[PDB]
Design a binder for this molecule. Structure first.
Ligand SMILES: C[C@@H](O)[C@@H](C=O)[C@@H]1NC(C(=O)O)=C(S[C@@H]2CN[C@H](C(=O)N(C)C)C2)[C@@H]1C
Length: 359
């Protein structure tokens, strides 16, 4: 029931007023929106996780988050780094000996963690096993030197997560599901959804409105494997702002260190997978932010006065996270349809702007 002067009702009015038109105009079947502010958490669910048979979005609904998954690979690499198992400045071939003598002699772990290796976006479809993957990587050359350009890459994120996990002595799937997500308290987050949670796994709806789930291929866990709830992602946002007891002291340091600013591209600062802009942000630069890479050396330390964000999509889903550490506020928006990023950022901006007076 609605209550004037009560936090959850005031926030719900703002969120409803933006999310309901957004879902109608984009034919989005279902969404969950989670907001944190002043140490308190608010979860709002809309519409349907599945159309036939109809299933509503609930607090337990799992959505694919696509490239939001890359921030977990970055957090894992950061955890390995602060634990003394990984140096980001070292070469990929230092950690992957089969690539010694290849172009990866000249690509750093930082490069694959910042989209500056030059590797292309998509893994070639005919690469099915590790032998084929290694043959490909051993024979690969970019047109420009590593460290000169930003090119978003699923392959690079794959290497980042693989190297991080190996430096901890485990597979990536083990590192994520047995170490990272449990230490973060994210008990409803998965690379592979278990049988008791399949009833909660929303269907995605593609551009043709067909129900789809993402097909996991080689190194896909690192780049697009996470299925999760808005509540678990809100915990992840809070952890990224140091708000939770948590994990480890090492885990808090790992999360914070992913916000280190390593390269500038246009107006955007590239962190370890996360991207950030100075806060306050005007909506135009947010939209303009969605290339030559200039190093930030020494790296920009993790900041409070920034808007940190990441989009992610699969064929059937569209996700977004943004948070402002200086304001201890953040938002997670999950949808089971891939709708345009300009709308994700605009709605998030309007919601977060609503959470305090102008001054
Ligand atoms: C699953 C993946 O195939 C896709 C993402 O969900 C692609 N990978 C990336 C990526 O994020 O690295 C974007 S590009 C986009 C370019 N800037 C975005 C971002 O982080 N924003 C807008 C905050 C990300 C592909 C669709």
């Amino acid at each position: 029931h609605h209550h004037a002067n009560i936090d959850e009702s005031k926030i719900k009015d703002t969120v409803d007023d933006l999310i309901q038109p957004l879902m109608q105009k984009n034919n989005i079947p279902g969404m969950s929106v989670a907001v944190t502010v002043n140490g308190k958490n608010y979860i709002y669910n809309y519409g349907l996780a599945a159309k036939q048979p109809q299933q509503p979005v609930t607090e337990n609904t799992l959505f694919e988050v696509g490239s939001l998954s890359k921030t977990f690979a970055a957090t894992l690499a950061s955890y390995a780094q602060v634990s003394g198992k990984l140096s980001l400045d070292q070469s990929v071939s230092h950690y992957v000996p089969e690539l010694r003598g290849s172009s990866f002699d000249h690509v750093s772990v930082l490069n694959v963690g910042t989209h500056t290796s030059g590797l292309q976006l998509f893994m070639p479809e005919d690469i099915k096993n590790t032998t084929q993957l290694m043959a490909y990587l051993k024979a690969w050359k970019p047109a420009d030197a590593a460290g000169t350009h930003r090119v978003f890459s699923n392959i690079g994120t794959g290497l980042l997560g693989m190297i991080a996990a190996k430096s901890l002595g485990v597979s990536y799937e083990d590192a994520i599901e047995k170490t990272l997500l449990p230490q973060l308290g994210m008990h409803h987050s998965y690379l592979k959804v278990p049988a008791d949670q399949m009833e909660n796994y929303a269907w995605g709806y593609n551009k043709k409105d067909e129900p789809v789930h993402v097909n996991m291929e080689i190194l896909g866990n690192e780049a697009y494997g996470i299925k999760t709830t808005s509540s678990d992602l809100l915990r992840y946002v809070q952890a990224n702002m140091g708000q939770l007891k948590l994990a480890n002291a090492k885990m808090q340091q790992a999360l914070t260190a992913t916000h280190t600013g390593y390269f500038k591209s246009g107006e955007i600062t590239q962190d370890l997978m996360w991207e950030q802009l100075p806060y306050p942000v005007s909506l135009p630069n947010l939209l303009t932010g969605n290339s030559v890479a200039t190093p930030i050396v020494p790296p920009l330390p993790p900041q409070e006065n920034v808007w940190i964000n990441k989009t992610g999509s699969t064929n059937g889903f569209g996700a977004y996270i943004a948070f402002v550490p200086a304001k201890k506020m953040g938002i997670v928006m999950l949808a089971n349809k891939n709708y345009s990023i300009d709308q994700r950022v605009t709605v998030a901006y309007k919601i977060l702007s609503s959470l305090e007076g102008n001054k």
